Fold this protein.
Amino acid sequence: MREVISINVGQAGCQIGNACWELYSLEHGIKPDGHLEDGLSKPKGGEEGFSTFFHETGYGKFVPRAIYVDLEPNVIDEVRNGPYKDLFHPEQLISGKEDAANNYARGHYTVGREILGDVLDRIRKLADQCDGLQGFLFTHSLGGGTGSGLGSLLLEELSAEYGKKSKLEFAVYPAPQVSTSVVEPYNTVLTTHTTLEHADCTFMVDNEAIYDMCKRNLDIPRPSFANLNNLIAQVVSSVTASLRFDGSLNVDLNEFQTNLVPYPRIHFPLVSYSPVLSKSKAFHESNSVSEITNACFEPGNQMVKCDPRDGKYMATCLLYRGDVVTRDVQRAVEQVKNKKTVQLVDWCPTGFKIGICYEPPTATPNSQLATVDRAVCMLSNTTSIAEAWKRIDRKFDLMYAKRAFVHWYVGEGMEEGEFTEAREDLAALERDYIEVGADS
Amino acid sequence: MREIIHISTGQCGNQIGAAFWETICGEHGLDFNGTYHGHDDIQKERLNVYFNEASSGKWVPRSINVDLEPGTIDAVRNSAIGNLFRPDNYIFGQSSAGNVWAKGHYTEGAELVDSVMDVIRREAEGCDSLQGFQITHSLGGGTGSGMGTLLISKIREEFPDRMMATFSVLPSPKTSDTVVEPYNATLSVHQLVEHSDETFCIDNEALYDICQRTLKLNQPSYGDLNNLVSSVMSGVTTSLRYPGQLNSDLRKLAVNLVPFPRLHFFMVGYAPLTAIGSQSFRSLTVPELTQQMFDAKNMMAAADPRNGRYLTVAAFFRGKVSVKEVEDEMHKVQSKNSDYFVEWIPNNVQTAVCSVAPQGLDMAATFIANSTSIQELFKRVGDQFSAMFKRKAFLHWYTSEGMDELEFSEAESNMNDLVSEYQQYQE
Amino acid sequence: MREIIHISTGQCGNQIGAAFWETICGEHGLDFNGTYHGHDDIQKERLNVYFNEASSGKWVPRSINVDLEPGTIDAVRNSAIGNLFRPDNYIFGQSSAGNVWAKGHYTEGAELVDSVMDVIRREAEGCDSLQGFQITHSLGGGTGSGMGTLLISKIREEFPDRMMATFSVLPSPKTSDTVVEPYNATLSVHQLVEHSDETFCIDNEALYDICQRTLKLNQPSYGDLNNLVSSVMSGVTTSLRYPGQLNSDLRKLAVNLVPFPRLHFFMVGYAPLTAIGSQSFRSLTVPELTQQMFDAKNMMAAADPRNGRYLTVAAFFRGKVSVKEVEDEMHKVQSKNSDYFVEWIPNNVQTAVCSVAPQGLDMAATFIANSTSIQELFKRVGDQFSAMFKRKAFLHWYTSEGMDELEFSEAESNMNDLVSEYQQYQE
């Protein structure tokens, strides 16, 4: 039950997962080649990992159980050029013969489920090899309709298959100002329709706010996609650190699910991580975790185009890694009580879900952020995403009424009722988030 | 009935029991390898009470450690006196209940309850003079507050005559971390009021305050707090174990420390709480300890003597102390605090004296109290619970767990009834 | 009548007898070359009982090992104490019976039964004080289940007065690679119930469970199971061989252990079954041995005291044990399990005490019982036979061999009659 299976869907999904396995093997001191290197060395074994994500073979080789699914042959060639393909199994990676469409009209259609059946039995075969499961992990992007399509469909298939394990879906949200592909408004609304069907936990991240942090905090002139994948690899390693390493307050993955979702339906909590500063600035500043908590509450450390100060505050998750001072977190919760900036509704106030990790944080040398011995992760629910979806819903309603792309959609196998149901679902989630916000 | 069984569970109760065993073996004298080192005969009696004599003069501490983590048992094994342990004495499960009382004692606790119950039954078959069960866990953590509650309920259903000494750590209001922490605490105590008969109020914020005012520690760590509570437990168990002028039993506390069987919460305090390095200036006398006991800064509940109304009190002492001194101190504190001391007793007094000297101190003192202040914490946790479940906040997961809101309302009503009983008896 | 003959057959009984001789030599003291090493006279007595005094003080064990494979005799020769053996003591044939009891005791056994009977007749002529015959085989394999059954029938027809104690390994219900295994087992027992006088229930699944719970073995290995059954056999034979407070004969077991002559099965258990490494924590006492014996986890039948009804029991001990302690334990277990203990006995007790200390242990214990679970196992194997031969699967082999469905139904009716005798006598 302790094992965790991760899925990599779409071009950005494989790039995020590759950085995830890169930082993973880097923390435990494992080379990307294999055998080993080295260990299973103090304490790279028990407590797991690396045995939850890195399955140990008969010879001791720690193979990362990941499924790289993408209908683009270029992405399959990219993940095969790296040494992690040698670490991976040829049956773990699923090669894409041809891209369905550009990019979601056919990815979520019958052409998508033709390959999903092959991946489904591969998951069943993988489940027969390694028993036990803690939660389903997903990595994809909303800009790539194939990643969001195959990821949402596979999420629904395993939900109807088991339905007992948690579902952690990482979805990359494009910026509301730039439109890398005009089909994205249709995909994001139809993706919210798939989440209304089945969704346990979805993480919304905006590339615009992340690139703004590299320009301001990391002092990067041109933030690349590799720095974004490394940052996501950092925020996901700190979240799973409660299961990997030891800590005074070990938080279960299902505990994150039963201490985050209040209402009969809410699936989209926001994530924030700190500190994210430059190398020279990290050598010049030696603040404690109290200042990191105060800076993590700011919208700058949110990595998303949403302001937690504007939206009302709900009970959040505050994870710590490294040397944690009980007085500092007591002083941290003392200052936020004295802040009284965000709307403290009568239900949350005594809530900042604490996760303590004795392992110090570790950052990749490629990332401009220096390796710090202390980190704070704030994962909160904020009504700002309802405003962001409303803008996306307004753009989607304008394009849908313009019928410039609906003709191609009904030719691919879509219907007018399907897009309206996704619109009615998205409008219901925004109304629900507003209703649960106005109850203060 | 001199033998006492010790139960350890939860993410904090494991270290609490480890520190308890450390303080016990430091009090009577014993090596971590089981070699007898005490002198001369009473230490063998304490070992027969709390330990088991294995082959080649070995001694194994009679403790039942259970938790949903192998890291916990590994860490308590890495302790000084933590190495030798019978594989049947400790049974740990997988993987986690996740700070939830319902899931803690419904799914993660129901799978390992049979094993630990068989273990405790075999121990009772091997322990003839068992009298009470020392429960050490944290009411803040839902996993511990569920597992220990389930174990206490099963022991009460199995051994209703045996005493239940619970040293659970109450959640702190300053800790604004998990809204499910005080809610799990109140759900667990709603059953512990009927499953347990002796509970001691221990607040984490109280421990932080007492280590920041006396020890002057920059970072309040569980180590020194567990050391303090283990010294308190060692004192209150050597009040009967170690020879003295008068020995106090758990049954003696059940028939003297509490007037009505509904009340089971007792506020504890220890002395002397001397500052680090100021031991040369401190003169161990009776008036200073008496003044320290009736102050809110030395209590670990932590209650204010000016706010609540004293329903009953008790003060136990270890070391060379005179009965006339403590009698005069009690008379003075009754003449000066007649408003706090309730009038229907009319004079509350329960003193035990141990002639033996405490470990490392010339004289030590413990204080137990029952006032009208625990109802204030009950009101606080009830208001937190009510304001936390008006939006179904973090609650639909609990509904899928199987619990209903009617049980929660009944728990709140029982807590309000207990508060009204503590207001009878008004403040 | 102190001398006992040993017969070994089957794919597992060969190693069982090898381990039996190994443990006998390890108990009394002897080299594999026949050199006497015991001290002083009781060891020579055991040697005259079990081994043969050859020239130059050589000692060769009186064992009749037979199997349809030269690899078996080669392996028991390459074993530690397996080098010297008279070529007449062992006779092996070719080639195989195809895991079929009928073929094994009709063709593969009929060609060597004359030779093995001549050998056993010469051995009985040379051995004046022979009392019992210890058979070691596995009821699972058809070849061994046929060979041992034929040998037991022939020895019963030749010397009906000599006792017949069999340690046949019962098949496991989990193993389903060959559906003919339990069917051959029940066809063998249908004749063994009349050809033998005492049989001991030994299940492969029970052995796997006990070794995985005590020794914590990953893969089921026959070595430790054979060593355990060897220790059991050594204990039950030294109950008479080695001096003690009272010696129990095979005739004594026959006239004190079974109420009616139709019953011949006995469920066995051994103690202490201590975990690996916990020997320092374990203290060899009488209550723990009694608990292990009356618990189902230490039984090798394997039976459940809560399910079956105790008809009769017996407990033998080796080492420094107290008669008053064992009497108190028997009284307590009778008062606590009077529901299992049947009322027409009314108090079943049969205790033998050996003053000598066990090899490597301060005290050891064996337990024999007759509950109502053997009839449940009979029902299970009969239902297996019925559900496997309703479809007439692999029945052409037996129709070509020559066995009859009327004979199968007669065997099933005899098993049902035994079940009624064990339910007479309700559960």
